[PDB]
Design a protein around this nucleic acid. Structure first.
Ligand SMILES: [Mg+2]
Ligand SMILES: [Mg+2]
Ligand SMILES: [Mg+2]
Ligand SMILES: [Mg+2]
Ligand SMILES: [Mg+2]
Ligand SMILES: [Mg+2]
Ligand SMILES: [Mg+2]
Ligand SMILES: [Mg+2]
Ligand SMILES: [Mg+2]
Ligand SMILES: [Mg+2]
Ligand SMILES: [Mg+2]
Ligand SMILES: [Mg+2]
Ligand SMILES: [Mg+2]
Ligand SMILES: [Mg+2]
Ligand SMILES: [Mg+2]
Ligand SMILES: [Mg+2]
Ligand SMILES: [Mg+2]
Ligand SMILES: [Mg+2]
Ligand SMILES: [Mg+2]
Ligand SMILES: [Mg+2]
Ligand SMILES: [Mg+2]
Ligand SMILES: [Mg+2]
Ligand SMILES: [Mg+2]
Ligand SMILES: [Mg+2]
Ligand SMILES: [Mg+2]
Ligand SMILES: [Mg+2]
Ligand SMILES: [Mg+2]
Ligand SMILES: [Mg+2]
Ligand SMILES: [Mg+2]
Ligand SMILES: [Mg+2]
Ligand SMILES: [Mg+2]
Ligand SMILES: [Mg+2]
Ligand SMILES: [Mg+2]
Ligand SMILES: [Mg+2]
Ligand SMILES: [Mg+2]
Ligand SMILES: [Mg+2]
Ligand SMILES: [Mg+2]
Ligand SMILES: [Mg+2]
Ligand SMILES: [Mg+2]
Ligand SMILES: [Mg+2]
Ligand SMILES: [Mg+2]
Ligand SMILES: [Mg+2]
Ligand SMILES: [Mg+2]
Ligand SMILES: [Mg+2]
Ligand SMILES: [Mg+2]
Ligand SMILES: [Mg+2]
Ligand SMILES: [Mg+2]
Ligand SMILES: [Mg+2]
Ligand SMILES: [Mg+2]
Ligand SMILES: [Mg+2]
Ligand SMILES: [Mg+2]
Ligand SMILES: [Mg+2]
Ligand SMILES: [Mg+2]
Ligand SMILES: [Mg+2]
Ligand SMILES: [Mg+2]
Ligand SMILES: [Mg+2]
Ligand SMILES: [Zn+2]
Lengths: 83, 155, 9, 60, 23, 97, 61, 206, 127
RNA sequence: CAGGCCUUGACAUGCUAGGGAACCCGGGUGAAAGCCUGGGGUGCCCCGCGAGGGGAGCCCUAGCACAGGUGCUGCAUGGCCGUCGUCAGCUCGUGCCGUGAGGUGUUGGGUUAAGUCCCGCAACGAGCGCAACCCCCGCCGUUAGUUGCCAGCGGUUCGGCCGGGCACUCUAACGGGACUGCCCGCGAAAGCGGGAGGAAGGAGGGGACGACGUCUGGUCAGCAUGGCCCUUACGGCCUGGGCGACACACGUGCUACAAUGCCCACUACAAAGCGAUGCCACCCGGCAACGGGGAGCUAAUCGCAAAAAGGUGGGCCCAGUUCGGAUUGGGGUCUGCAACCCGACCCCAUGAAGCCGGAAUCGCUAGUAAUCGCGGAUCAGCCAUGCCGCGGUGAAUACG
């Protein structure tokens, strides 16, 4: 994974929206195309609409999913099996 | 091999006994170009074969080769679309080759853990007329004796 | 015969 | 998607990763030699033509 | 064998170094 | 007076090596003969066809030959004469001390 | 170190929470599919299991 | 679909490069692009003068550009007017010392790129392709050459079925290295598409 | 004071200096049996003198570089066999009949495009 | 593919028109693109003390002409490639035969790798092919002696290190060399067998080289190009997704199933290449990936670099193992704006199938196969076990 000598990477333009919410008394639906953003404790409690190539997928953020990335919870392929 | 028949490669005689037949036998031991390892296996067994059964190593080797040379074998011929088992006399070139080949293979079928011991015991058992390589020779000689009815198809 | 644009296939 | 893509390649990109080689002559994005700035096809055409200094068919 | 990164032969095979093939 | 010259065509390279070595053999003193350095070869292997046919190739090499000549005792008569010398375009020269 | 059954507990516990949150890895532990980004068009037989052959597409006589 | 290019086969032996200079891996591409960019402009303009070759030589911030040609007229111009008007535009892209020269072509009918261009031009005018070929070969042999062969390939006469037709005289040994064989290609555009003309002129063995 | 031969075989080049002595050989600044320790084929480089009985009459100062320890051996075998005929031209006969005077041109064949090696081909399968 | 945008357009020439811009830094919104915007302020030549007004690189916007399309047709094409096939062939000119298609030559005997030559003949010649000229390898010479070499003297921190030298090894240019030229025998000859000499012998080994043509073979997606189609869209920019999906089936491969093996430590011998936002010695932190220092080299100099198999010593003892290294948990490193999808690498743990493979099927005739490692192109990194090269060790077999 990313070198921790670098930062825990967030596109800033999303972290911007998160912090203004905490100040103003959230919630609000958050539409982002930044799957590459890392989930961060300031996101706990919200729901974020993560784009998967076709749709913005809501993702309620919980404590146990804090260390992961945003795209992990907006799956990108529909499959539902064969036969 | 349509045009001319091939020439038989002459081998550099070995740096111990000065014997081509020894060099040929080591080449049948060799796998993946490791002639060093190969020659090392063959000589270590010569030690073993002088310890056990105090005969001369080179003398045991050659006699084991003699006891494994087959004098007759079956081949295939035509006469129509038929596939006969024809008994043929084995050429000296081929007697040596089959004898050497069956020895390594019989040796490696043995149950002794390390390679030189398998070759030591097989060369010992062969020089006394036992061993898988001798059982393979007699087996070949039998199949040419049975199909002696079709011997009149030989060339 | 060969997908490419509209024709797709 | 060709001429707009052969032009976008010359442009300076928002990041130094999005820069990719591109045949100066025909525009191939693939099999592009840094040395000649050509692609494997144009390289062959100019070599047979003698318009590449010193280059020649190798044989050994 | 060559497929096991955790041995010298593996490090040689992938052309890498580590505790199991250092410099 | 350390003079190294390079080129793709060696016939033009060895020619200009013989010229300069004889420029100091006229005025000057000791020449260190035109010693050939190992040729550095950059090869190019290409799929001979414009499409699909991978098992048919064509090889091209680009040879950069290297020659070295050393003038022992300069004598600025030589350092002058060298300025006037017919150096073909296929050759590029470099001089150090 | 934690060993034997105690270790297998945390390995289980991590896989389970990967499935609970519903991340992309947890989806692949659900379906027993390769998790570290491998091909599934072929191979994957260690993770997917023995082959389950199916009838295929046919030609014309 | 098999034969190798006759020039590139003989480079360094019977044929020499059309760009003679050295460079290093730092600016080789930049200079070679300049040659091509320069040679692009020349073949575009000097076509009407029958451009048979462009030689390039280099030292540093200067360039040769020796243009061989059948008619030096359209090159030089009035007292050296076009030769200036182009040399001006020339270094306007080179930014260097561009010293254009003009060499005359001894026999134009002994030059392969010219024979191909005369046939390519003749068939754009809707001339009898089969005849234009035999004549061209006939001219090259009348010009003393030891052999000639000419290939036109495509929709001859505008037929729907494409075709290849050729003629030859004397001898043209493409497998022979010591045989000086000038090769040249010209492409003829028509109402119905592209034809392709290959000219082979066998000068002699050296 | 010396007798020299140049022995080459397969990218390996040998410089053999035969000086009269006890039969003591060194190769690249160390002893023969130190530089060929464990290579049964080693005893083959000193085979030419066996044909002229010069076994312990010559010491040898030998250097070799390039190739591999067995290709270096065959170079030595040619090198000393090249120095002996310089020392004694009469050594021509009995050496040439034993083939010690020649170098084999047998070198590695180049890999070719469309193969795995020089001749090993990629596996064929119609359909 | 989805969604947010652009409409003379990302790009070419040409025409006007308004602004009258040149260029470089900002701002708001937005995922970005985009849309909206603000500052630093035009050289030609000029009427110039005047206010300055125009003309023009080039820009911006408006409007045309046109651009753009990896949309279709490889059954309209060029070019290039595959293929039969490195197979010995395919032809032409005149003459002769035949009403004619066509035949003859090119068939026949002998010979050869070869329509390669010899002999014969209503044929006599000639062309494309074959061979040869070209390149690498094998021996020898010559010319060269640094960054390469060290034979012999002299020093020698003991390293070709300094003196000295180019002998040698080498490196790289030019030559020599093989011609069935000589002997024996067969033969009508060409040739064939054998022998001598020679580094090399019957084309020395490998390469480059591919006849008229065939497959209406491949490629309109490298490029070119006729024709057809799209024109606020089948064109253009962007963010994200997909190209990496997975009940399955096939090809080409890597690693293995072990003791001629696996592991650890020590110790040897290559070749070809590559290397100034490059290779990076050496030193320190770290198990390590790597990080930080930090020389040298535009490189026969300095670096990649350790070659590996091998040699020596030591361990494992026939086990699904000290065989095998898949899968998975956790912890890190590096590139990159960014490694969720979907990177490589390191460390701890995990330690699957697999006991040599059914019907069937592939490669290779010698420095080959097998095996062992090394480099390069592409390239930020890399899914390379692929490709093109390089050497190390080095077989078996051909009756037919
Ligand atoms: Mg588009
Ligand atoms: Mg285009
Ligand atoms: Mg890139
Ligand atoms: Mg590229
Ligand atoms: Mg293991
Ligand atoms: Mg490396
Ligand atoms: Mg392939
Ligand atoms: Mg080919
Ligand atoms: Mg992954
Ligand atoms: Mg991965
Ligand atoms: Mg993977
Ligand atoms: Mg996948
Ligand atoms: Mg029309
Ligand atoms: Mg060499
Ligand atoms: Mg090899
Ligand atoms: Mg390999
Ligand atoms: Mg076609
Ligand atoms: Mg075509
Ligand atoms: Mg059609
Ligand atoms: Mg042939
Ligand atoms: Mg045929
Ligand atoms: Mg036929
Ligand atoms: Mg006639
Ligand atoms: Mg008649
Ligand atoms: Mg009649
Ligand atoms: Mg006829
Ligand atoms: Mg005849
Ligand atoms: Mg015929
Ligand atoms: Mg005929
Ligand atoms: Mg006939
Ligand atoms: Mg002929
Ligand atoms: Mg010399
Ligand atoms: Mg040829
Ligand atoms: Mg078709
Ligand atoms: Mg098709
Ligand atoms: Mg088209
Ligand atoms: Mg196109
Ligand atoms: Mg993607
Ligand atoms: Mg793909
Ligand atoms: Mg593979
Ligand atoms: Mg397989
Ligand atoms: Mg590289
Ligand atoms: Mg070892
Ligand atoms: Mg187990
Ligand atoms: Mg099992
Ligand atoms: Mg184990
Ligand atoms: Mg993990
Ligand atoms: Mg990824
Ligand atoms: Mg077992
Ligand atoms: Mg098997
Ligand atoms: Mg095995
Ligand atoms: Mg063969
Ligand atoms: Mg192995
Ligand atoms: Mg990379
Ligand atoms: Mg790379
Ligand atoms: Mg590699
Ligand atoms: Zn190109």
């Amino acid at each position: 994974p990313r070198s921790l000598k670098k930062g825990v990477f967030v596109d800033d333009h999303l972290l911007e929206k998160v912090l203004e919410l905490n100040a103003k008394g959230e919630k609000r639906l958050i539409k982002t195309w930044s799957r590459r953003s890392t989930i961060v404790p300031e996101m706990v409690g919200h729901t974020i609409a993560v784009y998967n190539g076709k749709q913005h997928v809501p993702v309620y953020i919980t404590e146990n999913m804090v260390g992961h990335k945003l795209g992990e919870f907006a799956p990108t392929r529909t499959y539902r099996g064969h036969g | 091999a349509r045009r001319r028949r091939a020439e038989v490669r002459q081998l550099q005689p070995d740096l111990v006994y000065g014997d081509v037949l020894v060099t040929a036998f080591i080449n049948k031991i060799m796998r993946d170009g490791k002639k060093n390892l190969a020659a090392r296996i063959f000589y270590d067994a010569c030690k073993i074969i002088q310890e056990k059964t105090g005969q001369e190593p080179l003398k045991v080797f050659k006699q084991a080769v003699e006891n494994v040379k087959p004098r007759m074998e079956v081949r295939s011929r035509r006469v129509g679309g038929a596939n006969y088992q024809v008994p043929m006399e084995v050429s000296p070139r081929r007697q040596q080759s089959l004898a050497l080949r069956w020895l390594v293979q019989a040796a490696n079928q043995r149950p002794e853990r390390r390679a030189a011991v398998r070759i030591a015991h097989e060369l010992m058992d062969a020089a006394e007329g036992k061993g898988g390589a001798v059982k393979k020779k007699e087996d070949v000689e039998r199949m040419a004796e049975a199909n002696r009815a079709y011997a009149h198809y030989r060339w | 015969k060969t997908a490419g644009x509209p024709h797709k296939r | 998607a060709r001429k707009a893509l052969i032009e976008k390649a010359k442009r300076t990109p928002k990041f130094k990763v999005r820069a990719y080689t591109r045949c100066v002559r025909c525009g191939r994005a693939r099999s592009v030699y840094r040395f000649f700035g050509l692609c494997r096809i144009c390289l062959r055409e100019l070599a047979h033509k003698g318009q590449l200094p010193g280059v020649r068919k190798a044989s050994w | 064998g060559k497929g096991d990164r955790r041995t010298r032969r593996g490090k040689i095979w992938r052309g890498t170094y580590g505790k199991y093939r250092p410099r | 007076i350390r003079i190294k010259l390079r080129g793709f065509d060696h016939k033009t390279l060895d020619a200009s090596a013989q010229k300069i070595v004889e420029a100091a053999r006229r005025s000057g003193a000791q020449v260190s003969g035109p010693i050939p350095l190992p040729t550095r070869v950059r090869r190019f292997t290409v799929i001979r066809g414009p499409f699909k046919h991978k098992d048919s190739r064509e090889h091209f090499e680009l040879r950069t030959h290297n020659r070295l000549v050393d003038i022992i005792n300069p004598n600025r008569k030589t350092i002058e004469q060298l300025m006037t010398l017919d150096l073909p375009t296929g050759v590029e020269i470099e001089i150090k001390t | 170190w934690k060993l034997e059954g105690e270790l297998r507990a945390e390995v289980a516990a991590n896989i389970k929470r990967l499935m609970d949150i519903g991340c992309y890895r947890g989806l692949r532990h659900r379906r027993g599919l390769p998790v570290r980004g491998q091909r599934t068009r072929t191979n994957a037989r260690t993770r997917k299991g023995p082959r389950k052959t199916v009838a295929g597409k046919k030609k014309a006589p | 679909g098999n034969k190798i290019h006759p020039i590139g086969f003989r480079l360094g032996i019977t044929r020499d490069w059309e760009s003679r200079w050295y460079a290093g891996k730092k600016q080789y591409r930049h200079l070679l692009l300049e040659d091509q960019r320069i040679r692009g402009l020349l073949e575009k303009e000097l076509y009407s003068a029958g451009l048979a070759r462009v030689d390039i030589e280099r030292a540093a911030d200067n360039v040769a550009v020796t243009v061989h040609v059948a008619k030096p007229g359209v090159v030089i111009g009035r007292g050296g007017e076009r030769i200036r008007v182009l040399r001006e535009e020339l270094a306007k892209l080179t930014g260097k010392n561009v010293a254009l020269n003009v060499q005359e072509v001894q026999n134009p009918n002994l030059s392969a790129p010219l024979v191909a261009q005369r046939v390519a031009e003749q068939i754009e005018r809707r001339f009898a392709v089969r005849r234009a070929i035999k004549q061209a070969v006939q001219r090259v042999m009348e010009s003393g050459a030891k052999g000639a062969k000419v290939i036109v390939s495509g929709r001859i006469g505008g037929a729907e079925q494409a075709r290849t037709e050729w003629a030859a005289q004397g001898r043209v040994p493409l497998h022979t290295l010591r045989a000086n064989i000038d090769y040249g290609f010209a492409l003829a555009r028509t109402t119905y598409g592209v034809l392709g003309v290959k000219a082979y002129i066998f000068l002699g063995e050296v | 004071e010396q007798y020299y031969g140049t022995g080459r075989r397969k990218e390996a080049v040998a410089r053999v200096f035969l000086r009269p002595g006890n039969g003591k050989v060194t190769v690249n600044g160390q002893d023969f049996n130190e530089y060929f320790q464990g290579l049964v084929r080693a005893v083959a480089a000193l085979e030419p003198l066996r044909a002229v009985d010069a076994l312990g009459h010559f010491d040898a100062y030998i250097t070799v570089r390039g190739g591999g320890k067995s290709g270096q051996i065959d170079a030595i075998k040619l090198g000393i066999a090249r120095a002996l005929v310089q020392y004694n031209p009469d050594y021509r006969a009995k050496l040439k009949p034993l083939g010690f005077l020649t170098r084999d041109a047998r070198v590695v064949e180049r890999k070719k495009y469309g193969k795995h090696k020089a001749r090993r081909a990629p596996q064929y399968s119609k359909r």
